[model samples]
Target: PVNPEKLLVITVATAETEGYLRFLRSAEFFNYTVRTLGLGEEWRGGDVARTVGGGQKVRWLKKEMEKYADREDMIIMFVDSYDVILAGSPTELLKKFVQSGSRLLFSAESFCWPEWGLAEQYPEVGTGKRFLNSGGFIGFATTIHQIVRQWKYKDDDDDQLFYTRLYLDPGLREKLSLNLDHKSRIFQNLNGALDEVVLKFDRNRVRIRNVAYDTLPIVVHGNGPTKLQLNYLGNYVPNGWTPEGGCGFCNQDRQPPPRVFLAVFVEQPTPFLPRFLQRLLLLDYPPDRVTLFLHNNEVFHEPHIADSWPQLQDHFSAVKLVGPEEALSPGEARDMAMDLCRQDPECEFYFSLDADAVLTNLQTLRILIEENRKVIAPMLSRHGKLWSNFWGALSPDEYYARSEDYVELVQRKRVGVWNVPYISQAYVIRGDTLRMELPQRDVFSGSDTDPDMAFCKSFRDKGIFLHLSNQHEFGRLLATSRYDTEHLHPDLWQIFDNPVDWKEQYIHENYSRALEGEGIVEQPCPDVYWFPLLSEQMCDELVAEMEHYGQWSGGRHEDSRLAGGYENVPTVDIHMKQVGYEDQWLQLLRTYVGPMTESLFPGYHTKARAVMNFVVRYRPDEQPSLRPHHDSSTFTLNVALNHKGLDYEGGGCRFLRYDCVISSPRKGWALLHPGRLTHYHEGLPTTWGTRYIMVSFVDP
Candidate 1:
C-alpha cells in the first residue's frame, strides 16, 4: 500500500449526533487523519434528511478540494458523517480504491433516489448493486475538483441530483473514468438493504460484511432513516467492545483503585432486605478500600441491620450504622451520609444504593467506578415495567417524562452510555463534585418537597451532567409494593407480588433442578415421595413466627379456626392464619408444591388449596407423636423444620400398610404422600430433642 503525501478525509457536520461521534471514534481507532468542515455553520439544506438536499455538504467539499486540485497525487474521501462509519483502516481503504481500476468510485445501493427517471441512464451491471448512492465517494483531488468545478447551485439545492446528472452523462463519466462500486468492495449503503449486512468479528477486528454479495465493505453509510440501526451496529463494531470481553473502552480509561464510601438507605420495608445486604457484600470491590454508612429508617428492618452489622463492621475500613431510634428524617439521613463522604478527603467516590435496588451483578460497583463519570448509575429497572433508575428526558413540569428511546434503553435494544436527567435508587457520585459543584448542605430539605427531586434540581441548576450506562446487565430493581411491616418475616409473605425476591430468600436452590428433568425424587416408602422444598432460612423464620404467636392449641379434638368450627382429629399445632401467613402459605402451595404433585400424580392437577395448614411441635414432654390413622385428605405434605440431630432426634414417619419407616428426616425437605385409604401413616416418637414440622392437608 502506497502512503499518499496528501490524503485528507473530510465530512461536513454542523451538529454532532451520536452516529457522527461514533464515526469519528472508528476513524480514530483506525488511526485515520480526518478534517471536519462546517463546524459552526447553520444547515441551510431545509431538512435534507427528510427530502433531497445536501448541496451544502458538496459545496463545502468542492471549495476545500479546489486548493488541492493542482496536486495530482492528493486524494480526498468524502462521506456523510452523521450516517456513516469507517469500517477499515485508511491503508486498507486506499488499497481497495486503487485496485478498482477507476479514478472515481461511488457507493452503490439498491434504490434510485431523487429522480427515478435517471434509472435507465445508469450503466447496467450483470449481478451486483444497481443504483449509485451519493452519501460516500472517494477520488483523486484533481478529478473530484474538476467534477464539481462548474457547480452553480444554492446551499439548499439537491447535491445528489447534481452528481447523478454528471454520472449519467456518458461524456463526463468517460472523462473522469467513473465507476460504480457495484460489488460493495469499498462502500455499503444500508438504506433498503439492512437485512443484507451483518457484523462479522475476527480474532483481531470486527467488520461489516454484505452477506448477500459476500463483500467486505470498508465504508458503511446509513443513508436514510437507518441511522439508528447504524448507531446500534457501531456500538460493537471496530473492536470497541463486546459482551464476552466486557468493555474494551474500560481499559482505555483505567484509574487506580480509589477510596469509596458506600451509603445504604433502608427507608422503607424492602422485600429482600437480607438479600440486598448480601449482594452489597458480594460487590467485587475490596472492602478495605470502602467505608460503609448505613441508615435504617424502618423499625421493622432493625433485626436485619443488627444481624449484618458485625460482618460489615469488621470488613470495611469504617462503619456507621444509624437506627430508627435516632428519629432522623430520610432526607436528613441522606444528607448526613453525603456529608460524611464530603468531609473525608480520602473518599474519592460515594455509592448510594437503596434497599429496593438489588445488585445481582457482582462486577457492577467496579464497572461504575471505571466509568469515571462525575454522577453516573448502573441502569436498573423493575421487571416487566418501563420504570428505571434514570429518566431519559424530563417533562415540562420537571417531572419524569418518557423519551422515545426509553423503551429501547430499558430493553437493551440500544447499548451505550446515555446522558440522563435524573438517577436514583443506585448511583455513584464523585467526592469532588459533592464538595465543590454538587454540594448538598440542605438540598434534600425545603418546604416538604421531594428529597430526590430537590437533590436532582440542585445538580441540574449547577449544569452537572448525570449519565447512565446500560452496556451490561447490572441487576434488577425489586418491587416493594404491598410489603407489610407488621409481620414476623415480611419478605416471606411476598410470594404473589414479589415472587423473585421471595424465591431468592426462601426457595430451595435445587428447586429449579427439580423442575427440570435432572432431579430425582427419593422414595422413603411406597407411595411416599421426598423432595427438597424450602431453604433453611425459611424453616427457621416460619418456626420463629409460630413461636412468636405463642398460641398453640392443646392436644384436643376441638377447634374454632376451621370453617365448621370443629375438628374430629387434632394435634398440638398453630394454624397458619393465627400468625398472618395463611395467604402466603396457600400461594406457596400453588407455586412450589403444585407442580411437583402433578409430576408424581399424572392426571391430577392440584387446586393448591389447603384447609388444614399448621406447624406441629413434637416434644418428649408434650405429645411426642401422633397415632396411626387415615388422614382426611387426598394428599398430605409434611415438611421438617429442623435437622434430625441438631434440633431434634427420633422423629420420623411410618407407613403402617407398607411396613416402612423414615427414621431420619432431613431439614427443609418435605414428604408428599397419599393421605387416604392406602397410605395409613403416623409420626414417630421424638425421643430427646424437640421436633417441629409443618403439615398441610390438600384437597380434603
Candidate 2:
C-alpha cells in the first residue's frame, strides 16, 4: 500500500450549491484560489442534485483533478458531502491521510441503511449491527486501480430511471468492479482468522483512520462545515489607477472617486515660469482632474502666477494660504510633504517643485503618473548665461583669472565627458520618502544644500534619479543664469532684452557669439546628437597630432615652465586630481595613469603605478592653436572641465614649439611629440583666456 508515492484528492457535493464555496475557502486557507464550474442554476436544492447527476460533471472534474493526480505523491479522496468541522490544518491532515495506506478508508454510517447495499449478503450481521459505509469519506489511490471499484448496489434496480441510466448500463458492473471475491476472502477468513485470508494484514496497509464527525478530517463531506467565512470589500474601490490613498473627505455612501495630490516648493522664479506654464497649458490631459498644493512661504502673489490655473481649477484646487510659516530646511521639506499626505488619506502622490522652476512639458509627468515612482528629475543646464560669466568671476592673474590656471582646467574637461554633479532645480516626489526622509534644510551652514543631492542620499536603495535630456518631451532649459553676470553671448543677451523663443537657440547663444569673427558654426545647441562617427575620427586624429606636437622643441628645456609662463605639475598627486578639473577627481588606479606610469618606469613599476602624475600648460595671445590629445597617456588621459573665454579671445590650440623666449615656428601651430618611451609631451595653454590639456591612461 505504501507504493511509490501518496496520491491526495478531495471531493465535494451539495444540494442547491451556488458555487464551490467551501472548496474556494479551503484554497484560501492554503494561501491559494480557484474557480468551479456548474451551480449556475438558481439556488434551489433540486437544481444542485440535478446538476451533479449529469455524468459529464464527474468527467470534467476528474480531468481537472488529473493535473495533480499524475504526480507520484498524491491520494484521491472521493467524498459526497461535508458534514463536520475540521479541527486540524489541511496540510497536516493530508500528510497523515497519505501515510495510512487504507486503499480505501470507507467511513461507516450510524444507521444500518439498506440503500447502502449490505442487506442481502450479510443479512444476519447487518440486521443487528447498525453500521454501513458513509458516502462522505472514500479515500483511494490511483496505484490501487485508480478508480472506484464499487460493489453492486442493493438499489441499482431503482435507478432504471432513464437519466439514472448511469446505474443501468449492462457493462456498468464490468466498468466499476475489479471483481476480487470479497466472499471468498471473508469465508476463507473463517479458515484462519477474521483479519487474515491468503495474506496477513500489515499495520501500514491502511490509511486515514476515523475521518468522521468532529475529528480533524482531511476531506469532509455529507454536510458543509469546517470552512472559515471570507469577507470581500463590496463597496470600497480605487481610483486614479492606483490606491495610494483616495478622497477620504466623503463618507462611504457619498464617497467620491479617489484622488492624489501634487506639491510644489518654490524659491526664486526664473526660466521655470514658462516651463511651468507649458506644463499646465499643454498638459496631455485635462488639468481639472488633479489638485496642486503650493508649499511655500510666498504670500499669495496672484494674477501672474495664480491666473495660470483658472481652467484647471475645475478638476484641481489650489489650497494655498496654509503652510509652514518659516521656510522649511532640506529635511523638513520631505517631512512637510508627508504631513500633507497624511492630511488627505486618499491622496496617493505628493510632488515637489522649485518655485522658479517650471515644467517645459508634460512628458515626464505622464511617465510619473504611469510608473507610480517615488521621485524623478531632469538633467540640469543653465539657459540664459554665457561662458564669460564663469571666466569673469574667477581669475588667476592679479590673483584673478590667469591663462595658466585656465590651461590647467579647460583642456582636460573639454576632452572628457564628465558630469558636474549638482542639479537641484526641479523634481517630482511620489512616495513617502520625500515626506518622511528628505532633510529639513542645511542646519550647519545657512547655505541651502541642493535638494537633488538630498533626494539622492535619502533612500539611495529604493530611489533612482533620472537625468533628463533635450530628447525628452518634458525637456526644459534654465531660463535665467544661476549666476549673476553679463551674458557671454551678446546675441542672446539682446534677445533676452525682450523675451523671445527661449528654447530656440538659447543654449548655443554664447558659443555662437564668440564664434562670429572666428571660423566656427554654432547652431542652436543641436540636440546633443552624438556623432559617433565624428568622435571616432576625432580620437584617431587627436592621437596622431599629439604625437607630432611632442617632437616640436619649443619650451625652455632647463625648467619645467614654458617661455609663455605657466607652471608645470610641481607635485604629481594634486596635479592629476586637478587635471580633469571636473569638480571630481579620477585616480590613477581607476584610469590609465597608473598603468602608464608603470610602463614608463619599468624598474619602479610597482611604485609608479601607485602614484599620480600631472602636467601644466600656458600661452599668451601671441602663440595659439594646439592639436587635441588622444592616447598620449600610458597611465591616464584627461582634458577640460572649465574654460576662460568663449572659443575666441586668443583661444585656440596652435601647433608650435619654442626653445627660448624668442618665438619661432611662425606657423602659429603647436604640436605634441609622440615619444618612443610613451611620455610624448605637448604645449599647454594656447588661449589668452587660458587653454588646458590632459593625458589618456592605458597599460600598453
Candidate 3:
C-alpha cells in the first residue's frame, strides 16, 4: 500500500471564506496532506469571482514545488482551492494518475482558455475532454518541478497560456511526456459540462461520476462559472455528509451547536401563522440552546401567539414577547433582537423567521448552521411560483430583479451557496458578525424601506456577504400579500392562496383517512351517507359569517339570489352571496365537498355548482320546518353548523319513503343523500331555540 502522505496536495488561497474552509475540511475528511499557499497575501491576479484570471495560483504553486523537486518518487497534485474538492483519497488519486502512464497529466476541459487559437496546435483527442484545464493536475514531483521551473511570467500573467505554448511545441510535449485527463479519471473540469457529472452513491459514500464518459473523477474542479455547482456538489461529496447519516461535518468543527436566539416577527396580517409556529416548534435543535424572541405586529395573530408562546417558552431556554400592544415598530423589534444577541456572549446565531415562511424541513436550522456562512438562508419559494426568500440580483435602483441564473437556481437546475443582495422572510446570521460589524440602532431602520431591505442595505454597505443555500428541500414561502383581515376568520377564505393552512384549519381529520380508503362512513338512512366533513372551527366560522351578514331572506317565494328569481322551497335563510362568500362556497363545493361526494357515489361527477348555497335557521317563532318536497338538485348536502338538541329541540330530517329519521345531527357532520327521485326528505319542526345548518344543493 502506497503511503498517502507520499502524495502532496498543494493549493493556493489568497483569502479564505466558507468555500475555502469547506475545501480544507474535505481534505481532512479523506486524510490527505494538503498545503495551502498565499493564505493572507493580496491577490495579484484579476478579479476571479466575476471573471476568470487565476494566474497567481500557478505562481504560488510554482514556488511551493521547489521543496518537492528532489523527491523523485513522490506525487504532487495541484488544484484550485476555492472551487475544488478531493473526492477520493490521495492513494486513489495517485493510482489514477499512474494508470494514465504519463509523466505529467493535466485536467481536461471542453474549451481552450487564455489562448483559444492554440487549440489547433495541440494534439487531437479520440472522443473525450479535448482542451487543457490548468485548474487541476497530478504528476510525479520531478515532472511537476520540470513544468513549474519553466514558468517565466509575472504573478498576473496567463498561466494557462504558458502551459499551452509549452504543450503545443511537439518536441517539449514528447520530452515532458505530457497528457490530459481525457476521460476525467483524476480531474473533472465542470464548466459547460455540468450536466455530464452527477453525484452517484455507492453504499454510503458519495462520488461524482461523469455519466457521459462513465468515469469517476477524483479531483472535481469547478472551472469558470461552475463554482456554484462545486459548492452544491460539496454538500454530499467526499464524505462531507449525507441526509441519512446526518451532517458529517456537524461533529467535526461544531461545538455543542450554536446557541441561537430566534427572533420571530409577524409584522403583517399574514396567512398560515399557526402552521408557521408549528414549523418553528419542529426545528431540530436543542431547546435548551435556543431562546425565543417573538414580535407580533398584527392584532389578528395575537391569539395564535398567546396560545403557542407559553408552550414555546417551556421548551426554549427563554422567551420574550413583544406584542402589538407594545407599539414597537417592525424595525425596532429586529434591532432589539440583534441587541440581545450582541449582549449575550453565548448567543452565537440570530435566526430571524417571519410568519410568511413555512419551514417544512425540521433539519433546516442544523443545515444552515452546517453551512457555516456569516449570514445564510435556506432557499424558500411559493408553490408554482418563482418568488423566493432571496433575490438573485438587485436592480440599479436597489429593487428586486431577476438574475441570469435566477430561474435555474430556483428550479434546482443549479444548486449552490449563492451570494444574494437581499434576503427576507427567513435568515440566519452570526451573532458575533452582526454585533461586531453593525452596531448602529438604525441598521434595520430606513425612511421608506422595510426592515429586511434596510438591514440588507446596511449589510451591503459594510461589505458583509449574504449567502443562500438550496442544497436540500427546505420549505416554502406562503403568499401573505392577499391576506384580508376584514373577515372574521380571514384564514378560512385562503383556500386558493394558502391551501395547506386552509386544509389543516378547516378540513376534518378523517378527510385524509376517507381518501386513503380507511374511513368508516356512516349510513343513517337509505342512500343517506353521513361523514365527518368540516372541522368544528369551520362550522363555527361559517355560522358566524352568516350571522355577520345578518340579511336573512323572508319565507316568501321570491328570491333574486337564485336563478329566475324563484324559490319553491323557501326557508328563512341567508345566501352565501349575501355574505360575499359565493365564490368561496362554490370552491368548497368543488374542491372539498365534490371529492367526498364522488368517493361515496361512484360514476357521478358534478361541477358541484349550486344556485342555492345558504344557511337555514330554525326557530319556533320563525320558520320552524321545511315542507316535504323533492329537491331540484341531484344531491343535497345538509351540514349541521351548530350542536343539535343542545342549541335547539325538535330538529331532524325525515325521509318520507324509508320512514326513517336522522335525528340529532352532530356538529360539523354532514348528511349527503340523493336529492331527486330516490329519496324524499323533510326538515322536522323546531320546538325551542334557533338551530343552524349549512345547505348546498349540487347540480340543481
lDDT of 3 at 83: 76
lDDT of 1 by residue, 620-658 (tens): 998788777766678999999999888887859998888
Summarize candidate 3's per-residue lDDT along 301-347 as a digit string, tens digits. 88888888767978899999888988988888888888888888899
Q: What is the per-residue lDDT of model 2 for residues 1-700, given as tens digits with 9 covering 90 to 100?
A: 3332243334434332212433344434444222233345322222232222223334434555556544445545443322221223445645554454443334332332324353343223321122323233334444223432221332212211211232223354235332211222100101111122111112322111221111223333222111110000000111101123321111112123224456665444243343364455464543444566654443333333556555445446544422446665535654555456655645555555555444556554554444333444543333332211112111212122432222322322211111111124555455454344443333113335444444443333222222212223343344444422232222222233223333132222332232233433211111100000112222232333333344322444322222233433231112433322221123213322233333334453522231233333434643344332223223332333223354223432222322212111211111222222322233343545533333333332
lDDT score, residue 43, model 3?
86
| Top model number, lDDT | 1
lDDT of each: 0.81, 0.33, 0.80
- TM-score: model 3 vs. ground truth: 0.71
Whole-model lDDT for model 3 versus the true structure? 0.80
Order of quality (lDDT):
1, 3, 2
The top-ranked prediction according to TM-score is: 3
Worst 10 residues of 3 by lDDT: 558-567
**Residue ranges of candidate 3 with Cα displaced over 4 Å:** 1-6, 13-18, 21-32, 36-69, 87-218, 223-225, 235-258, 274-289, 295-343, 359-477, 484-486, 511-520, 558-568, 595-609, 656-663, 677-681
- How good is model 2 by TM-score? 0.27
